[PDB]
Design a protein around this ligand. Structure first.
Ligand SMILES: O=C(O)C1=C[C@H](O)[C@H](O)[C@H](O[C@H]2[C@H](O)[C@H](O)[C@H](O[C@H]3[C@H](O)[C@H](O)[C@H](O[C@H]4[C@H](O)[C@H](O)[C@H](O)O[C@@H]4C(=O)O)O[C@@H]3C(=O)O)O[C@@H]2C(=O)O)O1
Lengths: 288, 363, 290, 492, 363
């Protein structure tokens, strides 16, 4: 019928599309078959109760939820704030230097960031404790203290990603036609009046899409940082579902329970991103 | 809210440029004045300088007795309609119009009645609960004008309002603008790249090329008596022909162009042009006809038809005199066809001449 | 934005804004110049609670320590290899596939678009992915690290979206002139896609360069190991041989100066290529260094 | 050709050796190259040098599915037996009998050594590391810091408390700061050993966190209720700053930092290498004199030295089932029990590290005059590694200083050394509990103890929950299973 | 070359709905035919179907003897000019023109005489070496037309060729298109959203609204005799005045208007009018005059001046009769004021009548 006739013309197009599809079927969807298989050994369905009752894992999902909340709350708005602040800057050279400096830490590797953390926070070595000693605040061992883990995390995280994540929002607020601001200026709108009454509600759909995308990975937050800097003493607060899955699955060589936790985390992620997409659809402009 | 506005020697400089140079225009209260010209000049920059959106690098501009140079746009008692869709997408039409008034909040009765009167003027009553996402371009410009009149300023500033619209909507909204000006009667400055809107709307037309103001006057003053060859070229639906020419022979009477064509001139006292003087001769297409002067006494021009463009009840005839070509408006049928010789009859009262070096009238 | 200046509250607003943003910027810049100075600085000064911002007695020896490391340079070569050929193998799969996904006429446009996009919001997992890497025989293999991730659905839908933003009149005119599919893509669409190409190749570059986890998981042989893994050993683990511990007192550089020197040598190419990239991407008033 | 060749044609083998979270095998090692020249067998290392934890690498290599030829390392004993019974390791018994005269003769002269490494079935899956000597660890203190601060060397726990307190408060060094740290070590576990001052045991043997025998009953030192009394007080020591805060982290760089930076006042560690610093860093630190001291009187009114050098510690190497050459490998292992094998393994390489003088091996002047301890040089040279070699104490006697020897003789004469725990022989069924549970239990104990030392948790408060957690983690199951052996072994 | 093109019952459907319905047009060789109409429609889809860029869902189309329904675009022997100028920014201008030809051989094709003739026709000697990035819009569309003519096809396909150019440049490119077709004379189909270009360029005009084909004919045939009220409203420089009207006592001799105005109608056999019939009366602005010039008295009408917009020598007068308003072209040179009543004289020969329901031509 048609499809054959269209394929005769599009053959060199489909030829382009094929290898990508093959790639996705192999390196992505085949692990889903292996996912359905890793469920049972060594039915099945039982070690989900082992996940249900554990004092190690329940605090891992506990701290996963906690870290999700903190990363959301403190981490998500910061790039928007940075974008708004940069947007209000004049003297383009200054704003340029600022943008360079602030966008820079994103290119710094994660293990190098963690290295900066462990170097700075080392007792009687790092500069932080030295500056604390200069003011007479004494000293604190940070990485061995479970209390300080999350603040250090989110701080290093905003230091690294705030600017690069602010880039998108900055591009979004620069895509607005000047007339909206100028007509407000004729009406005598102040700066805050403008960022509140026009800028923000205009940038809302962008931050909404970025928000649901953020909620997609929200369960996996800080996996590669935690896998690095978590001490046996700080294991309690630092441990996250992804970290649990890694430690048991790859290290402890237990595939079954770790993969089960993987199914749990993936399903909860898909559900929360489904509700996120829905609420960002019905309320806001379009979505994903 | 009826006030005069005086612009004296205003100049705006961006990075050692000076886009506009010493522009001076005085505007009477309740007068419709249009800044018109080609793209690139300071027509929009001037209007923006009046608005306060751009800084004045030199010269002074004032409304009534108050100098607004160091003032703020909010306090300048002016309202501006931009060319591109100044209404906010998330807010509704009613919310759009009441935006500027909602900036200072206060009495909801005032922002209510104001928007009622505005929407009554522009017919924005049914559109009050509507949103800008679904609207016409003309309707957007209407609610923008609603933003303008809800301010009740001393001056209405329009920057190319009808540029983004289509021809139909331009011709419609133009009449609606004139009609609107008949109601309020507020002082208004209007900026256009289109000659038509300038001719129709303005009480006075000021043309500006390259930051310089070329001429001022009534539309008919610019149409009948252009200051130079550029103003002559700019105004009218067809462009004025403007082709090179000389005289010699007889001075005060005859003037000859191109391939040996010769035209007799009316005395027009006060001219005293020179014989042999390099001149650019021009005439309007409406003032040239085909064999319809019934054996004219002045022995009019001769040409050879290039192409024929059927319009409607009228038609556009391109006729080539020598190395140059002039355009003449003709009747609807008129066989003609390209390649066959044709005699064109020129109206002696409507002829215009300019000088080749100094581009001014000199006639 | 506009440039009214004028109003007072707005003036103070702008000033305190510039101040806060300035402070934040300084807080962002501080660690870099710190670790630079400290890396240059002497081990004794660094140990005593000295240094901070500027160096003191310097040293220059710690860099001598890191320059004599074979596995460091080997791993650097590994990161170079992985970045180059990884980015290439990424583009090869992405660009034509996104170009094919871009054209409105495809039978499986819907279902293929789904096949790609679905991998965003749902993933099999860490362990099943590792196992799928195991039975593919890609373990402890550089090619397995390359073809392992050559594709992100994000880059694909981005390249596709930028391809769809291009006027169809070019492709249609090409078809009118006889150009069919591939010859089109190379001759017109690709040089029109330069910004998207730059963005994608950048994202893939920084993905390959700073890649750590799966690199350390899928690789065994130490000669195949990338810089970030070796960094995971030396920089954040900090455990060392009696040889290096005995090399502390015979040298006079500290371990911290060695660390700092390592991370300096690690971030130097980044600092080098960053201004070029940002200069290319901004090209105007701000808009970012994407 | 050589007389020590175990094969005529060259044999290259795949060896995975990752030990003590520090070193991996290197075929380019001088000792390794010498080993190849002598045995005509080249060991090619397949390992990640960039890796950190050795045990993890063992588990990952084992779970990889692809087995190498020879697998070496430390603390692999229990694992060697586990994967030995599962068939991942070939029994060397008949291979030892037929092809390994030296190892067989050794096990004949050392039945007790052979007993410990035997599986439940009795097979030997690995050639063990057999350290030679008498003592292991002893307490060391700064002699200079006892003078300028005017305090007699501590004879007990109170005097030591006041001395360390004087180190922290008063300035023993004189840089004009409080930066000095009273107690250090290169082994974090030693922070627990301090409880010996209060009369509690940190272990039953040289191996940290090991069981022991009290009056015929098998007991774990940490599980006792006398342990928390000492842990409370060492937590107090850590809180006052008497103990290095980084003691769990610093590790191998400790002595070369605290003593090198002149910040340390006290350490345990070992005799020879600790006394090597007195000669080594004397130039950089002018007033540094480190001396051996008898263990301070505890709260029980006794003199306790817990750590004693044990024979056949749980180190060594094994042969897999994929080796395909068990004969040349058991011969290769037999070589390291031979005199030349012991020579190249203990003393490094001839012409470089040592020379042959009068039927013995004597280190070069370059080695003995080095500030870095000899064993630390050998580690980087590929010598004194936890392979199946037999250690020669003379090698240690050479770089042992007269003061160190005086301290050793003092400890031996004083009989401060407590008897070592040999272990027990468990059957196939009862060992599985040990193998499965003891790892997790030990790890948990380590984490809890570390949490107690650093003061992140309260001892007395969390003690009950700690006990219950030990109960549900199967500690006392392993204890009772160990008693199940010991009671059958020793009676009257 | 010179070739005829026949379009027979061509129809394209998108899902359930159908954009074009049974379009049938026969095009003579060397004939200029323009598809004109509103934005949404199947005129562009039709042109695209001729081009081969879109598939034929039904009906057959052929050029000369070759049926192009199943064919490759390369073999369709047609060349197309797009709205987006369709030229590649990276390639050179000469390279742009030579794009399609570079696929077929090299050298002996010679390319020299071809690009020489093409660029000479469009008149660009220096522009041979250039990039589209640095050129203007009109030059881009011109060189695009150069790529079109370098193919030497049987059919020229134009899809809204100058949408984006300015009116000043648009009239010029229009004249240039007329001259080009007058020179070469190959068969060409032209698509426009502008009525003016359709009127001027086309030998035949086909109007298309969203639906099937509305009407065909010469420009003057469409101007004089509109098939319905839509064609009447669409074509002309001003739009045709269309106001509601009825008939009461006498049929052929009377037509009644809103404000109490009544007009006597010429008999014009072939009408078949009805008394009491609801009718929409149309009239051209050029066919309406002021008061008592000639007439007289049976053609007149009474109104009240709304607004007057001077264009030039002429002027646009908006006059309100009933609740509706009609537009009349007047001399620019007379003084007229708003608000005072005025009598308008309508030309009885040029009047149009349509049905309120059927909407077709009645009178
Ligand atoms: O320096 C000496 O005086 C000395 C003289 C002798 O000639 C011989 O060289 C002797 O070797 C000692 C060495 O001095 C250290 O004390 C060394 O400490 C080892 C310890 O024995 C274990 O092997 C330990 O294994 C750890 C491992 O690192 C992991 O942490 C694992 O998870 O847990 C075990 C553990 O014991 O808990 O590593 C220590 C280390 O290398 O730092 O022991 C040797 C000796 O031969 O036993 O010293």
């Amino acid at each position: 019928e048609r499809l054959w006739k269209d394929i005769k013309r599009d053959w060199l197009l489909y030829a382009m599309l094929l290898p990508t599809i093959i790639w996705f079927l192999i390196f992505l969807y085949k692990p889903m078959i292996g996912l359905q298989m890793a469920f049972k050994q060594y039915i099945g369905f039982d070690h989900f109760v082992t996940l249900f009752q554990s004092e190690q894992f329940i605090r891992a999902i506990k701290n996963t939820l906690t870290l999700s909340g903190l990363s959301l709350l403190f981490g998500f708005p910061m790039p928007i704030l940075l974008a708004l602040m940069i947007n209000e800057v004049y003297s383009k050279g200054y704003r340029k230097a600022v943008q360079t400096i602030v966008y820079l830490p994103h290119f710094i590797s994660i293990v190098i960031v963690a290295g900066l953390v462990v170097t700075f926070l080392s007792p009687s070595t790092g500069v932080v404790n030295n500056m604390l000693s200069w003011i007479g605040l004494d000293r604190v061992y940070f990485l061995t203290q479970p209390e300080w883990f999350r603040p250090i995390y989110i701080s290093s995280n905003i230091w690294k990603e705030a600017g690069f994540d602010s880039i998108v929002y900055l591009a979004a607020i620069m895509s607005i036609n000047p007339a909206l601001y100028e007509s407000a200026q004729v009406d005598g709108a102040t700066r805050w009046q403008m960022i509140t009454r026009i800028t923000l509600p205009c940038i809302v759909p962008t931050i909404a899409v970025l928000l649901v995308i953020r909620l997609g990975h929200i369960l996996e937050v800080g996996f590669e940082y935690i896998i690095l800097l978590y001490q046996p003493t700080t294991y309690e607060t630092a441990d996250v579902i992804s970290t649990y899955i890694y430690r048991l699955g790859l290290q402890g060589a237990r595939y079954d329970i770790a993969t089960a936790a993987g199914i749990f985390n993936a399903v909860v992620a898909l559900v929360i991103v489904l509700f996120a997409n829905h609420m960002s659809r019905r309320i806001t402009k379009t979505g994903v | 809210m009826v006030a005069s506005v005086s612009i004296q020697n205003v100049v705006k400089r961006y990075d050692k440029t000076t886009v506009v140079h010493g522009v001076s225009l005085d505007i009477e209260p309740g007068e419709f004045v249009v800044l018109v010209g080609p793209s690139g000049c300071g027509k929009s920059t001037t209007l923006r300088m009046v608005a306060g959106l751009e800084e004045i690098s030199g010269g002074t501009i004032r409304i009534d007795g108050r100098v607004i140079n160091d003032l703020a746009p909010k306090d300048r008692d002016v309202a501006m309609v931009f060319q591109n869709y100044a209404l906010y997408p998330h807010l509704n039409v009613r919310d759009n119009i009441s935006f500027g008034l909602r900036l200072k909040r206060t009495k909801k009765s005032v922002i209510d009645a104001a928007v009622k009167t505005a929407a009554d003027i522009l017919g924005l009553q049914p559109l009050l609960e509507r949103k800008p996402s679904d609207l016409s371009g003309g309707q957007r410009q209407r609610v923008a004008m609603g933003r303008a009149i809800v301010r009740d300023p001393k001056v209405f500033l329009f920057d190319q309002p009808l540029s983004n619209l289509d021809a139909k909507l331009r011709t419609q909204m133009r009449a609606e603008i004139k009609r609107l000006h008949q109601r309020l009667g507020t002082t208004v400055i209007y900026v256009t790249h289109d000659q038509v809107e300038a001719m129709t709307l303005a009480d006075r037309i000021v043309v500006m090329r390259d930051g310089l103001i070329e001429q001022i006057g009534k539309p008919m003053d610019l149409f009948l008596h252009p200051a130079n060859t550029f103003v002559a070229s700019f105004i009218g639906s067809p462009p004025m022909n403007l082709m090179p020419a000389r005289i010699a022979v007889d001075s005060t009477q005859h003037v000859e162009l191109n391939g040996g064509n010769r035209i007799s001139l009316l005395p027009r006292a006060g001219t005293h042009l020179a014989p042999g003087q390099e001149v650019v001769f021009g005439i309007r297409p409406e003032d040239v006809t085909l064999d319809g002067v019934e054996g004219s006494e002045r022995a009019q021009i001769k040409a050879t038809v290039d192409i024929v463009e059927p319009l409607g009840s009228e038609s556009i005839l391109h006729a080539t005199v020598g190395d140059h070509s002039l355009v003449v408006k003709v009747g609807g049928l008129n066989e003609v066809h390209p390649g066959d010789p044709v005699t064109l009859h020129v109206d002696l009262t409507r002829v215009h001449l300019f000088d080749a070096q100094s581009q001014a009238s000199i006639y | 934005l506009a440039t009214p200046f004028y109003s007072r509250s707005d003036r103070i607003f702008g000033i305190v804004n510039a101040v806060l943003l300035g402070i934040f910027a300084l807080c962002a810049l501080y660690p870099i110049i710190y670790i630079f100075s400290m890396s240059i600085s002497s081990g004794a000064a660094v140990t005593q609670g000295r240094v901070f911002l500027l160096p003191v007695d310097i040293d220059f020896s710690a860099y001598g320590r890191v320059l004599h490391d074979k596995l460091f340079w080997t791993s650097y070569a590994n990161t170079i290899f992985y970045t180059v050929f990884g980015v290439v193998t990424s583009l090869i799969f992405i660009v034509p596939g996104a170009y094919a996904l871009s054209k409105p006429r495809i039978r499986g446009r819907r279902v293929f678009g789904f096949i790609i996009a679905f991998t965003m919001w749902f993933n099999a997992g860490m362990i099943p992915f590792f196992l799928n890497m195991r039975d593919l025989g890609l373990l402890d293999n550089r090619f397995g690290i390359l073809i392992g991730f050559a594709c992100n659905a994000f880059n694909i839908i981005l390249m596709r979206n930028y391809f769809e933003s291009i006027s169809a009149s070019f492709e249609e005119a090409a078809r009118m002139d006889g150009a069919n599919d591939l010859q089109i893509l190379w001759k017109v669409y690709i040089p029109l896609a330069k910004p998207a190409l730059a963005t994608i190749t950048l994202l893939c570059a920084i993905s390959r360069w700073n890649g750590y986890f799966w690199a350390m998981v899928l690789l065994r042989a130490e000669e195949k190991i990338p810089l970030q893994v070796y960094l995971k050993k030396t920089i954040v683990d900090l455990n060392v041989n009696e040889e290096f511990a005995g090399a502390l007192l015979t040298n006079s550089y500290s371990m911290e100066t060695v660390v700092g020197a390592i991370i300096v040598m690690s971030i130097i190419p980044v600092i080098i290529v960053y201004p070029v990239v940002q200069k290319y991407f901004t090209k105007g008033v701000m808009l970012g260094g994407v | 050709k050589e007389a020590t060749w175990v094969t005529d044609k060259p044999l290259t083998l795949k060896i995975h050796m990752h030990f003590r979270d520090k070193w991996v095998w290197d075929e380019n090692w001088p000792v390794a190259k010498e080993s190849f020249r002598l045995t005509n067998v080249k060991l090619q290392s397949v390992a990640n040098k960039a890796a950190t934890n050795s045990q993890e690498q063992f588990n990952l290599m084992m779970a990889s599915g692809d087995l190498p030829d020879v697998v070496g390392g430390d603390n692999l004993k229990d694992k060697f037996i586990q994967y030995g019974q599962e068939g991942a390791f070939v029994p060397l018994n008949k291979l030892i009998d037929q092809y390994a005269p030296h190892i067989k003769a050794f096990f004949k002269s050392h039945p007790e050594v052979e007993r410990a490494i035997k599986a439940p079935d009795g097979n030997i899956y690995f050639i063990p590391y057999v350290p030679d000597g008498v003592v292991a660890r002893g307490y060391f203190i700064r002699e200079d810091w006892l003078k300028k601060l005017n305090l007699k060397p501590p004879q007990n726990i109170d005097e030591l408390y006041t001395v360390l307190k004087a180190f922290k408060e008063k300035d023993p060094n004189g840089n004009g700061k409080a930066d000095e740290v009273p107690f250090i070590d290169r082994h974090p576990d030693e922070v627990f050993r301090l409880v010996n001052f209060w009369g509690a045991r940190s272990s039953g043997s040289d191996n940290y966190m090991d069981f022991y025998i009290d009056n015929g009953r098998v007991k774990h030192p940490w599980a006792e209720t006398a342990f928390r009394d000492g842990m409370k007080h060492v937590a107090q020591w850590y809180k006052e700053g008497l103990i290095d805060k980084e003691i769990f982290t610093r590790k191998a760089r400790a002595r070369e930092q605290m003593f090198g930076g002149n910040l340390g006042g006290f350490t345990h560690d070992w005799f020879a290498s600790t006394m090597t610093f007195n000669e080594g860093l004397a130039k950089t630190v002018p007033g540094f004199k480190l001396i051996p001291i008898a263990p301070p009187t505890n709260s029980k009114g006794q003199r306790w030295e817990e750590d004693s050098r044990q024979k056949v510690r749980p180190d060594g190497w094994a042969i897999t089932v994929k080796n395909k050459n068990p004969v040349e490998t058991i011969k290769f292992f037999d070589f390291y029990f031979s005199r030349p094998g012991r020579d190249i393994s203990n003393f490094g390489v001839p012409g470089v590290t040592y020379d042959i003088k009068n039927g013995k091996a004597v280190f070069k002047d370059s080695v003995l005059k080095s500030p870095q301890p000899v064993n630390n040089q050998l580690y980087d040279m590929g010598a004194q590694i936890p392979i199946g070699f037999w250690q020669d104490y003379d090698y240690e006697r050479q770089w042992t200083t007269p003061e160190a020897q005086a301290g050793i003789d003092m400890y031996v004469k004083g009989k401060y050394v407590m008897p070592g725990f040999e272990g027990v022989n468990m059957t196939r069924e009862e060992r599985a509990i040990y193998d499965k549970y003891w790892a997790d239990v030990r790890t948990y104990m380590y984490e809890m103890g570390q949490a107690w030392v650093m003061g992140t948790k309260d001892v007395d408060k969390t003690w009950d929950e700690y006990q219950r957690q030990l109960k549900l983690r199967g500690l006392y199951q392993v204890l009772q299973m160990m008693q199940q052996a010991y009671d059958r072994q020793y009676k009257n």
